[PDB]
Symmetry: D2
Subunit: 471 residues, 4 copies
C-alpha cells in the first residue's frame, strides 16, 4: 500500500451524506478546510465528520486550516456569474456599487491608487486576462484580452503591483482563532513573503495559548527568494501553484516546485504539492495524460504529499479524484520509491541516527522501521529518505499522529508514555502483534531515546525480533 500522502480540500461536494467518510476510506490523509470560502458552521460540521470517520475507520486523518491571507477578490455580480469576452471593456472599482458585467467591485481598496495603465489583471489564475487602460476616478478601466466566464468574489492577481496588505487580516485572525479552538492540527498561511511572517501567526497562538504546525504556502516571488529561511522558520511548506503560476511566469513553476521539494527534504520538513494536479477530473471520470504525469512527477521529485483542491471540494468525481491519485502514486512507488538524494550528510543527532537506522533496516531486510518521537522530528528525518520499508511512528501525543499524516510513508501508533526503553520495546511488540501483517520472530529496527519524555533526546537503535528476549 501507499507511502505518498493525499491532501483533499473539503467543500460543497463533500457535504452530502457520509462523503467525508468515503474519502477517508478511499485514502484521504489530510483534510483541508479552506477559509477563503464557507461559514463557521460549515467548517465545524466538516471537521466533525473527519473526526468521526478517522476514528471510525482507524485511519489517521490530519485537519488543516487554510487561511485566506491577503487575497484580492472581486465582488458579486447581479447575475452571480457573467462572461467577459475578448474585446470588451470592464471597470473594476474601489467604490461600492451594484455589481454587474460592466462595473464590478473588489476587496483591495488601493486598486485605483496603485494600478497604472499597462498593468495586467488575471482572473481565476488565467481563466480571463485583462490589461488596464486607465484609472477613471475610483474605477480601473480595463480591456479584456482573454475572454471567459467570471463569478462572484473570484480571485484576481495583479502581477507586478506592489500590494500592501497585512500578512494576517482581521478575518484571518478570527479564523485562526476559531480553527485553533475547534481543534485543528495544522494551519496554512497564504501569500507568505518573509520568514518572520510565522511570528505573527505564532503571536496569535500565544494569545490563545495553543500552538500548532504552521505551513507556508509558497505563492509569491518573495517566498521563493527566501526559500531556505522560510523552510527553517516554518514547519512545513506547500507549493501553491495556482497563485504561484500567475505571480511568477507559469513556465518557471515546474522548477521552483522541484527546488522547493528538495529544500524541504533537506531540512526535514513536509512538503505539499498543490493545485490542478488533476484539474481535468472536476468534470471528467478520468484525467488527462498530463495530469497523470504531473502526479507521478511530484512523487519522483520527492513530495511528502499531493493535494486536490476543486477536484474534491466542488468536483463531480471527488472519489474518483482521490482514488485515481492513489493508483498513480502507488504505480510509481511499486517501481521505486527512491527519491533525489540529499546534497549533504546529516549533521544533527536525530538526523544522523535516523540515517543509520534506515541503513541497518534495509540491509537486514527488516520487516519494519519503528521510531519513537515526541515532536515527530526524528520520524521526519527518516521519512525524507524515502525507504521502501514500512515506517512506523510511536508517540504518546495523539496530535502528532495527525501531524504525521502529511509526512511521507509514515503510519503512527499512539501509546502510553513510557519511562524505560525496555518498556518501549514491549509496547512495540504489543501494538505490532495485533496487526494482520505482523508476527512473532519478525525483525524490526527501533529508534529511541532516554530519558523518555524528552524531545530531541533520541539516542538509540535496537534490532529486535518480535517476541524474543533480545533486550
Amino acid at each position: 500500500t501507499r507511502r505518498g500522502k493525499i491532501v483533499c480540500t473539503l467543500g460543497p461536494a463533500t457535504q452530502r451524506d457520509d462523503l467525508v467518510r468515503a474519502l477517508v476510506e478511499a485514502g484521504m490523509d489530510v483534510a483541508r478546510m479552506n477559509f477563503s470560502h464557507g461559514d463557521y458552521d460549515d467548517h465545524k460540521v466538516a471537521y466533525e465528520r473527519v473526526r468521526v470517520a478517522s476514528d471510525a475507520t482507524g485511519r489517521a486523518v490530519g485537519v488543516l486550516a487554510d487561511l485566506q491571507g491577503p487575497k484580492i477578490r472581486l465582488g458579486r455580480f447581479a447575475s452571480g456569474a457573467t462572461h467577459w469576452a475578448e474585446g470588451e471593456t470592464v471597470r473594476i472599482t474601489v467604490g461600492a456599487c451594484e455589481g454587474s458585467h460592466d462595473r464590478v467591485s473588489t476587496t483591495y481598496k488601493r486598486l485605483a491608487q496603485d494600478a497604472v495603465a499597462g498593468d495586467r489583471v488575471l482572473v481565476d489564475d488565467g481563466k480571463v486576462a485583462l490589461v488596464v487602460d486607465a484609472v477613471e476616478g475610483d474605477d480601473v478601466v480595463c480591456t479584456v484580452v482573454e475572454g471567459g466566464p467570471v463569478s462572484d468574489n473570484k480571485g484576481i492577481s495583479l502581477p507586478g503591483m506592489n500590494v500592501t496588505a497585512p500578512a494576517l487580516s482581521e478575518k484571518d485572525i478570527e479564523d485562526l482563532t476559531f480553527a485553533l479552538n475547534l481543534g485543528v492540527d495544522m494551519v496554512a498561511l497564504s501569500f507568505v513573503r518573509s520568514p518572520a511572517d510565522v511570528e505573527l501567526v505564532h503571536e496569535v497562538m500565544d494569545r490563545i495559548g495553543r500552538r500548532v504546525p504552521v505551513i507556508a504556502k509558497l505563492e509569491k516571488p518573495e517566498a521563493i527568494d527566501n526559500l531556505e529561511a522560510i523552510v527553517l522558520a516554518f514547519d512545513a511548506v506547500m507549493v501553491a501553484r495556482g497563485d504561484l503560476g500567475v505571480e511568477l511566469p507559469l513556465e518557471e513553476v515546474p522548477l521552483v516546485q522541484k527546488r522547493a521539494i528538495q529544500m524541504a527534504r533537506e531540512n526535514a520538513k513536509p512538503v505539499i504539492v498543490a493545485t490542478q494536479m488533476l484539474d481535468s477530473m472536476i468534470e471528467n471520470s478520468r484525467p488527462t495524460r498530463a495530469e497523470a504525469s504531473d502526479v507521478a512527477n511530484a512523487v519522483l521529485d520527492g513530495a511528502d504529499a499531493l493535494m486536490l483542491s476543486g477536484e474534491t471540494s466542488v468536483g463531480k468525481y471527488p472519489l474518483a479524484a482521490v482514488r485515481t491519485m492513489s493508483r498513480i502514486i502507488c504505480a510509481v512507488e511499486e517501481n521505486s520509491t527512491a527519491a533525489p538524494p540529499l546534497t549533504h550528510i546529516p549533521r544533527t543527532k536525530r538526523g544522523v541516527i535516523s540515517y543509520a537506522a534506515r541503513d541497518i533496516g534495509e540491509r537486514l531486510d527488516a520487516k519494519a522501521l519503528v521510531a519513537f518521537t515526541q515532536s515527530g522530528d526524528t520520524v521526519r528525518r527518516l521519512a525524507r529518505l524515502h525507504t521502501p520499508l514500512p515506517l512506523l511512528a510511536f508517540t504518546a501525543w495523539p496530535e502528532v499522529r495527525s501531524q504525521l499524516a502529511m509526512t511521507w510513508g509514515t503510519e503512527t501508533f499512539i501509546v502510553p508514555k513510557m519511562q524505560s526503553t525496555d518498556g518501549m520495546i514491549r509496547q512495540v511488540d504489543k501494538s505490532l502483534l495485533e496487526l494482520a501483517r505482523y508476527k512473532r520472530g519478525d525483525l524490526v529496527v527501533i529508534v529511541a531515546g532516554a530519558p523518555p519524555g524528552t524531545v530531541g533526546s533520541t539516542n538509540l537503535i535496537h534490532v529486535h525480533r518480535i517476541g524474543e528476549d533480545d533486550v
Copy 2:
C-alpha cells in the same frame, strides 16, 4: 534559443489563411498530417503551406505522415453528435444502420464475434466508458457507465480484447502511397505490435521505390513488451499516450514514457512525446499547472520532441499552444539541458567519436559543434547526449535537414558535395560566417569522415577557428 523540438498536428484550425506560416514562425519543427481525418486535397494544401513557409523563413520543417493504422471507430450519428449519459443503454453494431443515440455503427466487423459480456469500451481515449452487457446478433448491448458527449466516427478501444486487423490496411497502404509521392520526410505507423511491422511498411516503400524514416507509435502493450527490438527495427518512436493510456492502465504510462525515452536515446533514435501535453489550451488561453509540469518533465526525461495534437489541429489558441510549449521548454533548458545519462559507454565508431567530440567542445568552451552526415546518424549520437553547445549538422542531402528537425537541439545546413575533408572545413567556415551570430576566429569542433560521401565513414575530429589556417 530552443533545443527541444516541437511537433504540431495540422487540421481545420491550421487551414485559416497563412496559419501554417504563423506556426512555423512561432516554432513548429515538424508538421504532422494525420491521415485519420481530411481528404487528399486538404493534406496536399497543408503540405504546400509548410514547404512555402519553411522555404520562406529559412526554418527547417519536417513533414510527418501519420497513418491511421488498425484504429477501430464509430459511425456517424444522424445528428452528428449525441450525449451518452450514465445509466443509458447503447447498442454498438457490426450492422449498417441509420445511426443515433440508441444504435450506432462501427468499423471493426468482428466486434460481435469478438466482444464478450464484461468487456469494456472506452470512447475518445477514455472520456466515455461502457461495459458490454450482451451480444444480440450483430449488436453489442452496453450500459453507459460514464456519461458524456460522443461525436461522429470517434475512436473506441476494447482493452485486452484480441483484436485481429492488419498492421496496415488498404487505406493505410494507399495513404502511404499518396504521402510518399507527395514528398513527405517521415512516416508514422499507428498501433505497432511487433518489430517486424516495419517490414510491411518497408515493402510498400520498395515497391513504390522511395524509402523514408518510419516512426513507431507506441500505444499497445505488445509494443512495450518488445520495446528494445522495436526501437532498433524502427528509425524513431512516438510515445502515443492517448491510446497507450487506455490500452494500458493510465497510471502505468508515466513510467513507460520515461523508460521509452531512455531506450531511444540509448540507441540514438528520435523520440516524440505526444497527446494532451497542453490539452487544456484547446479552450483556454493559458494551460494548467499540470500541463506545464508535463512538458517540463518531458524535457527532463530527455525527449527529442514534444507534440501537440488537438491543441493545434482543432484548437482555439493554436499559436499560443505552440508559443507556450516553447517558453516552457526554454525555461527548463535555461536552467540545464542535462538529460539522464546513458547506461552504457558507446561501442560504435560513430557513437564513440561523437562522444569524444562533445567532450572536446565543452572542455574547450567552443562556440559550436559541427557534424557532417550522410544519413544523420553521426549527428543523432551527439544529440542524444544533450549538450548546451549549438549542434550544427552539415549534409548534402536536403531531406536529411527535414529528418533532423525532430532530432534534439540540431540545426542543419545543406551543402554541395565535397571530395576532400580539407574542402569540408572551408565549407563550414563559409556557411557559418553568413550567420549574424558567428565571427572569424571563433572556435568550433568539426566531425567528419573520409572518404566523403559514404555513410558511416565518419572518422575525424578537427578543432578549428573560423577562417584560420589550421588545416
Copy 3:
C-alpha cells in the same frame, strides 16, 4: 597514538635483561615465538618475560606461536657449513649420511622420487641456487648455478614441484601441545595449502582441549589459488613473504599481498604483513628508502599488522626497528587512515551494525567508538573500516584482549560479566573516566547486544555522553 599493530619475532637479541620489556615499552603488540629455532626452555622464559612486561605496563600483548610446518631442509655437514660455488656438482640425497660439500642429505624423503631434471633448488630463501640434472638412485645431482655458503639444516625450496607432506608434522604437533599448555593466544601454521588444513590443527586442539585463533601463513601457490576459502576457514592470515617470494616469482608478491589484505578485510579477519619489511635494520641504525616505503604501503593497503622477523630476533637494533616501524606507521596515519573500501555492502547483522555505528560516530564528532564482544567478531568488522576515532573493545574474556592486539586500531578493556545494558554502560563510564584522557559529558557511541554474554547477540547502538542520564 598508533592504530596499526606491530608484531615482533623474539630470539637471541631479545634475551638480554629486560629487553622484552623494552619492546613492549617501544610498541610491540604481538610477540612471535618462532618454533623453528630455540628450545622449550628458551620459549618458556621468553613467554614469561612477555606476560610480566605486558602486565607491568598495562599494554595488551598477544603471544603468537609460529609452527615450522612442512619445512624442507638439508641435513648436517661434517664441517657444519660449506660453500657451494658456481659450476660445481652437488648431490642432495634421500639417503642417510652426514653431509659434506659433495653429498648432503635432506628431510624431504621424496626428493628423488618427485624431482625431475630441470627443477630448481633454492637455499636460504633464494641466495644459493642449483638446478637438477639427474636422479641417480637415491641422490639428486645438480649444478650450482649461483654460488654461496650453505650451512646445516638450511631451508630449501622446491619451487613448482609438488611436495606431498602432512599439514602438521610430529614436531609441529608437539609444539602445538607445548604452546597450548604454556598459554599462548594464537597459533600460526606455516605452508598452508588447503582450507581443510585447519581441521587438522583443530583436531589436536580438541584432543588437548584448548582452542585458540589459528593464523594461516600464505607462502604457497596453492594457498593463493584457494585464498578466499583459506581466509574463511582460518581465523587470520599472514602474508609470509619470505617463502612466498621463492615459491612464487618474487615479482608476483607485491600484488598477492594487496589482494590478500583486501580478502581478509572483506571477511573481517586480521591480516599480518611479514618478512624483510625493514631488513636492513639488522645491521644499520636506519632503514632504506624502499623499506620505509614498504611499511607505509602495507599501511595504505589496509594491513591490521606489520611484522619484524630477523630485525628483532637476531638483529642489532631490535628497539630501533620497532621504534622506526611505529614512526612510519604513525606518519602515514596522521595524514589519513583511509583504507581501500570494501567491494560489498555488509550483509551480516554484526557487520551491518558496526558499519552504521562508525557512520554515526564520525558524523556526530564522537570521542570514541565502544564495542562489546564475546569473541571479537563485532569489533573486527568495525576495525576493518579503518576509522580515525578511537575504537575500544569491551569484553569479559581477558584472552580476547590479547587476541585483539593484532586487530587494527583497537584498544581493549576487560570488565566483569554484565547482565544489563545499564550495567554495560556504567562500566564503560567507569573505565573511560579513570583515564586522564576522558572526561564526564564526553560523547561516545556504544555497540552492544542483548541477551548479554552470548556471541553474536549484538543488536544495539547507544549514543551516550560520559556520566549523563541517557540510558
Copy 4:
C-alpha cells in the same frame, strides 16, 4: 613490452667492455651520468658507449647529466679515512686543514657562522650522526652519537639549518657546459629549493646557446613546500629520496613521493623515483621483499620512471638489477596499468584532445595511439593517463625521441618534416608497417595538428586503418 621507464646510473661497474651495451639490451631507457664522481674522460667514454648501443639496437636511450649542486662535504683526512665512534668529540671547521680523527674541514664555509648547539649532522646520508655542542672560533664542536667510518669528502647533511648557497656552483656551471657540448638530452639539478633556480640553469644554457630539459631533484623541505611551482617552472622532477630522507624525516618521504608523483602527472611532467629501490642488489643476486614492493608501489603511484643508482654504478649485479626491476614493473602492468586519476578535467587544448584520443582508442579496441609532437607536450598529456594501448610518438626532432625515453609507456619514431596531413598519415603507415607486429587494416588513432611544424598546433584526431582509404 614494458611501459614504465628504467633509469640507470653509470659508473665503475659499467666500464667493462660491452657492459653499457648489456644494459641497453636489458632495458635501460635513460642513462644517468653522475657529475659528483669521475672525470670528463670517464663521462665522455660512457656517453659514447650509450649512443653506440642506442643506435646499434634501435632502442631510444636518453642521456641525463646529474649536477652535484650545493652539496656540503667534508675535507680530506690525512689517512683518507677515520672511524668515529660514539662518545668521541669531533671538530668540523670552516678553517683550512688536512683532516685527522679529531679535526676535519668542510666545504660549507658558513658552518661556524650559523650552526647552533643542538643541531644535528648526518654523515654519509645518515650512518654516522653527530650533535652540535658549540662553536669555538671557526670550529664546530660535536659529539658522535652514532659511530662509524668517515672517509674523504663525504657528504654531510645539516637537517633543519638554513644553508645559504647558490643554486648552481662553479663546478656545476662548468659541468653543465661540458655536458651541453657533449650532447646530453636532459640535465638534473640537485638540491633545488625554488622555482627561480631553473632561471640560473636556463641563463647558462643561453650563454652557451643550447637548452635541454631541466629536471628538478626534490631533496629539500623547501622543494616540497614549493612543489607545485617547481613542477611548473621545471620540465621534470626526480623524487631524490636519499637526501630527501635525511633532510626530512625518513618516515615523511613515502607520502611526499606519492604527492609529488601526482603533482607531476597533473601538470604533465615526467617524474623519476630514485634511490635504494633495489639497494640490496649491490651484493645480492635477488632483492628483498620490501624492495620488490617499493618498485611495484612506485608503478602504482604512477611514476613515469624508476631509477637505480649504486645498483648499476658500483654494484656486482648491474644486469640483474635492471632485469629484475623490469620483471616487477612488467608484472604489475600486466595486471593493470590503471593510475590514480587526475583531480581535474583537462582544460588545455592539447590536454583535452589527448584525453579524447585515449577515450576513442580504448572504446574502439584500437591497436595503438599515435601522437605527433614537436616538443613532446601533446604526447606527455596522454602518457600521464596510463593507457594499456601502445602509445607511439612521431616527431621530426631526434632529440625529442631521447627526451621521451623517460616518459611513461611511449615509443618514438623519427620522421621527416611534412607539410601535409595526408603525408603524415602515410608516414605513420610506412613506419608502422616496418614492424612485424603492425599490418594493413589495423586500426589506429592519430593525434596531430596544422599548421605542421608548430609546437601546440595540435587540433585533430583521425581514426585510421593501416593502408585503407580513410583519409
